[model samples]
Target: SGSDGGVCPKILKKCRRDSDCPGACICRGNGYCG
Candidate 1:
């Protein structure tokens, strides 16, 4: 949902914690939520 048209931007930070990610996706901490 943070992405544009289902694509996450490379410059954007995915998450800083588990809550930052939606559903059951986990934050990789390296700037990714999967």
Candidate 2:
């Protein structure tokens, strides 16, 4: 997993919190989950 179970896109996904992602993924840059 690049961030959350190998589902991170090129720029990653959008999120509002670290829990917004899966596994151990983080909510990067206050907007993306990666």
Candidate 3:
């Protein structure tokens, strides 16, 4: 979300850190900051 400091669906772990996410979502572990 370049428009503002917000969560970007693009960078949902998939783009930022691959093999880090534990699920479909980037923040895996159910929103837990692992």
Candidate 4:
């Protein structure tokens, strides 16, 4: 399985790029790079 990193449940809409995450990612909404 893959981790959501520290980008969910708390850090929503924080990234604008996939590389901003720590695992396989898909930028959702307007700024969720997780």
Best candidate according to lDDT: 2
Please give the clash total of every predicted structure, in order. Answer: 0, 1, 0, 0
Q: What is the lDDT of candidate 1?
A: 0.52
Ten contiguous residues minimizing lDDT sum, candidate 2: 1-10
Residue-pair clashes, model 2: 1
**On a 0 to 1 TM-score scale, where does candidate 2 land against the true structure?**
0.45
Strongest candidate by TM-score: 2
Give lDDT for model 4.
0.51
Which of the two candidates, 2 or 3, achieves a greater TM-score against the reference? 2
Can you give the lDDT of residue 13 in candidate 3? 39
TM-score of 4: 0.32
TM-score of each: 0.42, 0.45, 0.19, 0.32
Where in model 4 is the C-alpha error above 4 Å? 1-13
* Candidate 3 residue lDDT tens string, 1-34: 3222333354333333433445343333444312
Over 4 Å off in model 1, which ranges? 1-13
Tens-place lDDT digits, model 1, residues 1-34: 3433333323344777745665555566477664
> What are the clashing pairs of model 1?
none
lDDT of 2 by residue, 1-34 (tens): 2533545544466777765775566567758776
Error of 4 at 14 (Å): 1.4
User: Where does candidate 2 clash, by residue pair?
Assistant: 1-6
User: What stretches of model 2 exceed 4 Å from their correct place?
Assistant: 1-11
